[PDB]
Amino acid sequence: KSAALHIDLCKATSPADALQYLLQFARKPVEAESVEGVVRILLEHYYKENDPSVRLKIASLLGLLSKTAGFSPDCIMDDAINILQNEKSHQVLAQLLDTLLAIGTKLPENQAIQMRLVDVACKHLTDTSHGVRNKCLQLLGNLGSLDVQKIIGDYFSDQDPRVRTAAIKAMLQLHERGLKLHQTIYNQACKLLSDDYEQVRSAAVQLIWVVSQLYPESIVPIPSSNEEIRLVDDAFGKICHMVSDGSWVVRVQAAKLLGSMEQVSSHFLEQTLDKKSGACGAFVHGLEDEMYEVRIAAVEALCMLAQSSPSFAEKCLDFLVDMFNDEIEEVRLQSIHTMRKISNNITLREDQLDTVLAVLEDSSRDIREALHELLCCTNVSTKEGIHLALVELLKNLTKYPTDRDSIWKCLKFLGSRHPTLVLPLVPELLSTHPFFDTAEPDMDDPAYIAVLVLIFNAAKTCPTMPALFSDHTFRHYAYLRDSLSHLVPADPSQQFLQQSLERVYSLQHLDPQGAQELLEFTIRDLQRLGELQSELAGVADFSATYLRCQLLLIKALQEKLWNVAAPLYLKQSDLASAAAKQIMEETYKMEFMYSGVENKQVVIIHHMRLQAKALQLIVTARTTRGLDPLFGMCEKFLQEVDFFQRYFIADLPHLQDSFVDKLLDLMPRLMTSKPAEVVKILQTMLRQSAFLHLPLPEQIHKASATIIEPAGESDNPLRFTSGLVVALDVDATLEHVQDPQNTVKVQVLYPDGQAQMIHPKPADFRNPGPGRHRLITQVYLSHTAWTEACQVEVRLLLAYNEGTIPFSKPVKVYIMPKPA
Amino acid sequence: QSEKHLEKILNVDEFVKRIFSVIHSNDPVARAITLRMLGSLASIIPERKNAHHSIRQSLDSHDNVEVEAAVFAAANFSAQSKDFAVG
């Protein structure tokens, strides 16, 4: 429709509605040859129109069409630079430079066109408009000559701050693309660091950090002194001064870049945490800033610099202790985490230790857990401090019994890493009288296990005094070794599954009764194998469902209805009609509740689906007296077979003697056959069809779902006003679901016929692990008045591309709509 | 005689605790009867670790009735718990 575009642009109007037509055209994709055609037409129409807005829209649409996927833009660059040659409007010129930047970015390999484009950018950099200079600097930054550094350094000193930011970001892009920068850049960015604009200062401090990282060991002179300073130290001082900026995002940027200057000398590192050149007190100022983001960024800068420099961590220590009590919870979480990170070899003295143990008493569980891992990773002398830590942990356990596992982990790590210090404390912890026979302490009392976990982990690395234990302490040691062994210290199935499957396959020549008996035996064995080997459970019930499909097919094909005529057929004792429906349900369950399926299994699944459809066709043909509905779904079945041969034509030569290839042999007869004869030949040809083989997947699991938050074991009704809503929270443990975002659905079933199906949003499908998903929705329930609190049925469902199948355990919730 | 009804008591912890309190009796006959209780209750207290420890300790006792009751309790708990079975 390129000629339609030509006609509509040159035939309706010039000034205004042409812009509307271009706007309407810009919203549809164009194929690459048609991209070339419309580019030629629009560039021909560019010279005709003298309206600048129409030409701006033309330039934008050229830039959009140059970004199409399959279109190589090498043939349109010359006309583009030709229309830049005689373009006077600055906005249209800026849009044209944007188009040229898209052209250059789409073709990185061609060096000649890149040199041409940077020549155009260098030509147009002297434009009076700031937008043209901005786009030309972006063009130089994106392409360059990896001369360009000198020109961008010249444009660091432009009058417009936007052009200055464009130049700094362009040369940062040059460094990021791979180009190595000069050193005069450092002086220019140092001059530009005191700019009156926020964005210029942020870009300049980024450039200062980059040029410091490029040449850390370079020696530069002080402007006001004879002494010489390393480049990384001087840039560290500049960024430390930028930490005290008036803009909070500039402070965050300065702190974050300050964290990555690991090559700074130690002297400036002790300077930056002091309170008495320009680096003095930078982190002290950053840790007390009003914006919590700056404090967080200074915390990570402290963490990185203390990980780099071990002598810095001792100075970091007391500031982290002071900033544990911070008004923002995320800030104190970060402070505790970084304190744990930098606690590799430094010891805690008394006041820092009991400040940590004082903030252990906090009501938030998150910082309590974080402080628990800090106590796991802490090193401490002065064993009375260890006793104080144990007392504070025990009273935390009394105040918060839910954290007993974390507290036991703390005491395991404290005993395992401070063995000699716990050793004199043992008679004070275990109430061991020197001569009295002490009463046996109550086991399963979480304070006493907490003491024993500390003691036993101390006794592991020190065998000097394990004889301080009494007899009941040794008995409790045995009990904890049996129960808490992770804390206290001191393929036949696959072969059987293959053998059972090949036993089924190799005995497919028996009588129908023997085949049913063999299939029942192997289904029972596969079910019990799934109940025994957990990692083979998915493949076990996968093959069990396949053999159940085959068993249902065999039992349906050996019914008493084939021995009676069509008028004498009676459906009130029928079995095959339910069998075909069951095979359909099992095939859908097989295809969609199994994670490890592939095409080599989907083809057999669809083959069994075809066999079930044929069986249902013959069953329905038994009970139909009219000729045209039978002909109708016979034609529908042959259409389904044609769709199957079209979709799965690649792996057709693997299904020897099966249903579908024996259909394909008789297919030209099948189009020309009378539909009752088609039904008869299908009935006689299902019984002669050979049983297929399942290619076993390497890794396959059932999609499992259980909900725990409705918790259908409480008989207390959930009361609300009739006609209003009541909210129900669910917590689903989805296991091995491939795409739970678009397949898992919540079904609520009221006691009447209402079966409202709820689609959860993707925002609350939490993924805490590989193959593990968590579903937390607040489903909404409403109905009018009930005379008694009946029930409601909550069920998870799996949806596929046409129907839905049950997915989880049915759970009943009591609901009592009271009248208003 | 009431094994099918003891799955519907739901105050399991204090009931089992007050039965289990007389595993510490010095009488070996009382210890044997409690081991037979634990084996009888093994359907509703699997993975109950103090019961496992009591069975393991009573298997090494010097009284024949207590050892026989510990064997009976171990046979019951091994059927209902795989963590008991592996050790």
Q: What is the DSSP letter of A810?
A: -
- Is residue A730 within 8 A of residue A779, CB to CB? The reply is yes
Query: How would DSSP label each residue in A711-778?
Result: -TT----EEEETTS-EEEE--EEEES-S-HHHHEEEEEE-SSS---EE---GGGEEEEETTEEEE--E
Could you give the CA distance from residue A181 to residue A209 in angstroms, rounded to a whole number? 12
φ/ψ of A562, rounded to 5, equals -75, -20
Could you give the CA distance from residue A323 to residue A302 in angstroms, rounded to a whole number? 12
Could you give the CA distance from residue A516 to residue A526 in angstroms, rounded to a whole number? 15
Could you give the CA distance from residue A360 to residue A396 in angstroms, rounded to a whole number? 7
Q: What is the DSSP letter of A433?
A: -
Would you tell me which residues 11-30 of chain B have a C-beta closer than 8 angstroms to some C-beta of chain A?
A: 24
R_g over Cα of chain B: 12
Neighbours of A794 (CB within 10 A): 24
Distances (CA, A) of A792 to A184, A185, A760, A777, B17: 75, 71, 19, 17, 37
Q: Which residues of A touch B55 (CB under 8 A)?
A: none
- Is residue A84 within 8 A of residue A127, CB to CB? The reply is no
Q: Kindly determine whether residue B50 and residue A475, on different chains, have CB atoms separated by under 8 Å.
A: no
φ/ψ of A738, rounded to 5, equals -65, -50
Could you give the CA distance from residue A556 to residue A346 in angstroms, rounded to a whole number? 77
Q: Which two tokens mark A318? A: 């007391």
How far is the alpha carbon of B79 from chain A, nearest alpha carbon, in Å? 13
φ/ψ of A728, rounded to 5, equals -125, 125
Mutation target to probe the B interface, by most B beta carbons within 10 A, among A474, A483, A486 is: A483
SS3 A27: coil
B31 touches chain A (CB under 8 A): no
Interface residues of chain A, partner chain B, Cβ below 8 Å: 440, 443-444, 475, 478-479, 482-483
Mutation target to probe the B interface, by most B beta carbons within 10 A, among A443, A471, A479, A486 is: A479
Distances (CA, A) of A615 to A81, A292, A583, A637: 70, 70, 10, 11
How far is the alpha carbon of B2 from chain A, nearest alpha carbon, in Å? 23
B48 touches chain A (CB under 8 A): no
Q: Kindly determine whether residue B49 and residue A479, on different chains, have CB atoms separated by under 8 Å.
A: yes
φ/ψ of A327, rounded to 5, equals -70, -20
R_g over Cα of chain A: 39
Mutation target to probe the B interface, by most B beta carbons within 10 A, among A476, A480, A482 is: A482
How far is the alpha carbon of A396 from chain B, nearest alpha carbon, in Å? 24
Q: Kindly determine whether residue A475 and residue B57, on different chains, have CB atoms separated by under 8 Å.
A: yes
Neighbours of A804 (CB within 10 A): 15
Which residue in the set A444, A479, A482 is minimally distant from B87, CB to CB? A482
Distances (CA, A) of A230 to A257, A340, B85: 18, 32, 68
- Is residue A202 within 8 A of residue A236, CB to CB? The reply is no
Residue found by looking up tokens 């129109």 in the block:
A49
Could you give the CA distance from residue A423 to residue A468 in angstroms, rounded to a whole number? 10
How far is the alpha carbon of B52 from chain A, nearest alpha carbon, in Å? 8
- A and B: number of Cβ contacts within 8 A: 19
Q: How far is CA A414 from the centre of its chain?
A: 35
Q: Which residues of A touch B57 (CB under 8 A)?
A: 475, 478
B56 touches chain A (CB under 8 A): yes
* Interacting residues of A712 by C-beta distance below 8 A, sequence separation 6+: A794, A811, A812, A813
Q: Kindly determine whether residue B49 and residue A482, on different chains, have CB atoms separated by under 8 Å.
A: yes
For chain B, the residue count is: 87
Alpha helices in A324-403 (DSSP H): 329-341, 350-359, 365-376, 384-399
Q: Kindly determine whether residue B57 and residue A482, on different chains, have CB atoms separated by under 8 Å.
A: no
| Best CA proximity match to A734, nearest among A780, A777, A674 | A777
Residue found by looking up tokens 């983001």 in the block:
A293
Resolution in A: 3.6
Q: Kindly determine whether residue A482 and residue B56, on different chains, have CB atoms separated by under 8 Å.
A: yes
Q: Which two tokens mark A403? A: 């954290």
Residue found by looking up tokens 């109550």 in the block:
A442
| Best CA proximity match to A1, nearest among A23, A48, A33 | A33
- Is residue A392 within 8 A of residue A357, CB to CB? The reply is yes
Q: Which residues of B touch A440 (CB under 8 A)?
A: 24
Q: Kindly determine whether residue B52 and residue A444, on different chains, have CB atoms separated by under 8 Å.
A: no
- What counts of helices (H) and strands (E) characterise chain B? 5, 0
- Strands across the sheet containing A765-769: A704-707, A732-735, A772-775, A765-769
Neighbours of B56 (CB within 10 A): 16
Q: How far is CA A50 from the centre of its chain?
A: 51
* Interacting residues of B32 by C-beta distance below 8 A, sequence separation 6+: B63, B65, B66, B68, B69, B70
* Interacting residues of A696 by C-beta distance below 8 A, sequence separation 6+: A497, A498, A501, A539, A543
Q: Which chain B residue's Cα is nearest to A532?
A: B82
Q: How far is CA A51 from the centre of its chain?
A: 49
